[PDB]
C-alpha cells in the first residue's frame, strides 16, 4: 500500500535526477527540483504520522551539533575520517563521556558524523564542514544566541492573541534574552566579548554574494571630484568594498569609507586602513549621514534588519540630509523575496530577523519603503537565480 | 564533479529501494537503509557547506509549525487538500496575516503544507498528521516545555565546563524554565491547566508499544487469592493495563491497580473506575509501596525518567518493601538502546529525556540499576525490530 508511494517517488527521484545530471550549469531549477523529490522519498518512507516526530529529531540534533561544537568535539576530532574514541574525545575536550556519548547519537544514523564502532567516532566532509569559516562563523552565534529566540516566536506571539506586536525593541529575542528596550545589536554589543564571534558572523557569506550585478566602474568613474566616493554603510568587515574595489580598479583617487557603530570598526579598523579604506564610527538611528555629495550610498544586509517604520525610513531620512538630487544614489543590496516558491533558505533566514524585528522583503515591499520614503526607484538590478539584488534609488 | 556523487547516492537509493519493496514485512532493516540513502541523497545534492545550514531551517521550520499549530491553523484550514488564502486563515484563526505569510514560507517548500498559490495554502497529508492523537498530544507538549531546554543542554553544561552536573532537580528544563529544585513533572502540575495536556503526551504511543511481548495470561492466572494482583506503577490514563486485560481475559476476580501522583489520578479515575481498575494515588519517591504480595509491579515508560542514583534505587527499594520474595515480579518496560546502530528515534528520546535529568538505558545499563538494587534479573524480554523490551526481576 505504501510500497506504491515509495516506488513513485523513487521514479520521480530518477527522473529529476537524469535531468539534473544533463542540463546545463536549468541547472539550478533542476537541482532545487531533485531536491525537493529526494526530500518527498524520505517522507513517504517515513509516513506521515513518524515523519511528525521528525520536528523532536530535529530539534535535539541541532542542540548536539552545537554542544559538540562549543565543547570543542569538532576541533579535537582528526579530520580525514580517521576515528577516535569517545574516552579520547572526552579527555581532550573536558566533555562528560556519558553526555558525549548521549549527544552522538543524534549525529551518527544520519547526522553528519559517522559511528565507526561502540564508542568510536570518526569525521566526515559534512561534518568538517562546520569547520569551515562561514559555518564556523555563523553557527555559534546563531546557535547561542538565535534559535532560542526563534523557538520562542510562539511564546512571544501568544502574548499579543497572534497579533503582530513585534518591533525592533519589542520581539522574541528581548523575550529570550530578558532584554526589552533593547535591539539585538545593542544586547549583543554590551558585552565586548561577544564583538569578535558576532562580526564574524557578520562576515559570513555561504551564498557567497554577487557583487558584479551592478556597474560600479562606470558609474563611479563618471563622478569628478568629490562626487567620486562611496560608502559603506553598516560595511562591518568592509568585504563588501573589497570587492567593488576589485571589480573596478580603472579608478581615480576615489574614496572608500566603511562606516559602523564603534565596535565593529575598533575590531576592523587596522584591516581597513591597511587597504586604504577610511574607518568612520556612524549611527544611522541617531545621527544624519556625515559625507555629503557621495556618488553612492551602499547599504548590503542592513535594512533586512529594520521595518519600514521607525527605523527604515529614519535611516533613509539620515541619509536622504547628505544627498545631492541628482549626482547622490541609494543603493539597497538585500533579498528579495519572491512572492510565490520562495525556499528554506529564504524562510530560515526571514524567520530568523522576525525573532529581533527584522524582515526580508518582496519587490512589493521594498516599494513601499522607497515611497514612504519620497525616493524613486531607479532600476532593479538582480542576475535571475540570484537571491540578493540591488535597489536603486534617488531622490524625486 | 558533484555529479558523479549525486549519480552514486541515487544508485543507491534505487538499490535500496528495489531491496525493500522486495523483502518481506527484513522489511524494517531494509526499510531503515532505504531511509539512510535517501538521506544521503539529500545531503550529497545540497554539498557539505550548504547542508550546514540545515540546522537553521529546522529551526525556523519547528518554530513555524509551533505558531501555525497553537495559533489554530491547522484547525481552520480545510482537510484533505482544498485550498485556503491567508486573508481567511487570519481572518478565523486572529493570526496576524504578515506573520502568517512569512511563517507559511517555513512548511511549504517541503514542509508539510502545500503552496497553491500567492498567499494560499493547502493540507497534504503530512500536515493533517499533525492532529492526530498522538502527535497532537505530543507535539504541543514538547513545543510548549522541552524544545526550549533542549535547545539550552548547551548552556546548562557550559555552567559546569562540559561535566555532568545533570539531576532530576538541576538541569536544562529547571535552567529555561527557571524552576531550581522542581523535577519536571513537579513543575508542571504546579498549574492545573498543564494536567489536560500533559496527561494527554503521557498517552502519545506513536511507535505502537507492544504488549504481547511477555506472557501475562500464564503468569497472572498461577497467581492464586491474594497474590493475583497488578499494578500499574505510574501507570497514568491506564492504557498500559487495558492492553493487560485485553492479552489475558482467561481470569480470575484479579485485581488490576493504576498508580499515579494525585493530579493524573484525578484526570482519569472516572474512566479508570469505569472499566473495573482501581486508581490509587501514590508517590514512589515519598512513600513504600501501599500493596503487598502483588504478582507483579509494571513499570512501563516511567524509569526512563530517572537516573539509578538516587531515585532509580529509591523506587526500586519502595516496592521492595512490598514484594514476596518468590511470588512478586518488577517488570521494567522501556526502550532498551543498543551500544551501536542506535536510530534518531533513540536520540530524540534519550536527549530528550537529559533536559529533565532522565535517560534511556541500554542492556548494561539496566544491569548495574538491578544489580545497585540487590535484585536479579530473571529475563530480558525483546521481539526484535520492537525498541522496547522488558525487564524482568526478583530478589535475589
Ligand atoms: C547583518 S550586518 C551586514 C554588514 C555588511 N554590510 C555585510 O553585508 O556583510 C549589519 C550591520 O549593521 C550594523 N549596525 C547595526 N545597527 C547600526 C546602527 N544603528 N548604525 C550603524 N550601523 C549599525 C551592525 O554593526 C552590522 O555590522
Ligand atoms: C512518561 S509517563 C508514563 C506513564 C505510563 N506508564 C505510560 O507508559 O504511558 C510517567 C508517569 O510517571 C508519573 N510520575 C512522575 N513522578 C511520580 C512520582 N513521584 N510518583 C508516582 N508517579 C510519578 C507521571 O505522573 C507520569 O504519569
Known sequence: AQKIAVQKDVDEVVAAAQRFLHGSGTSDEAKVDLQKKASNLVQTIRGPIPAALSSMEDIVKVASLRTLFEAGVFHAMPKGGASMTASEISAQTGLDKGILIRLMRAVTPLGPFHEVGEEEYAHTPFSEAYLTADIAGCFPVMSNFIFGPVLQICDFLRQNNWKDAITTRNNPFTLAHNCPGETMFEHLYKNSKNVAPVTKAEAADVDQIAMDLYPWEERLSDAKGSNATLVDIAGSHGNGT????????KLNGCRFIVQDLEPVIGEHSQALRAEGIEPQVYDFLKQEQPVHGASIYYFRRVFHDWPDLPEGKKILDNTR???????????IHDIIVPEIGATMSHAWQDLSLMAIGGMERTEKDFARLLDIAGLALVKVWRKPG???GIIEARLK
Open 242 to 249: 573589497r570587492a567593488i574595489m576589485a571589480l573596478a580598479p
Open 321 to 331: 540630509a547628505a544627498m545631492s538630487r541628482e549626482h547622490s544614489r541609494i543603493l
Open 386 to 388: 540570484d537571491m540578493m
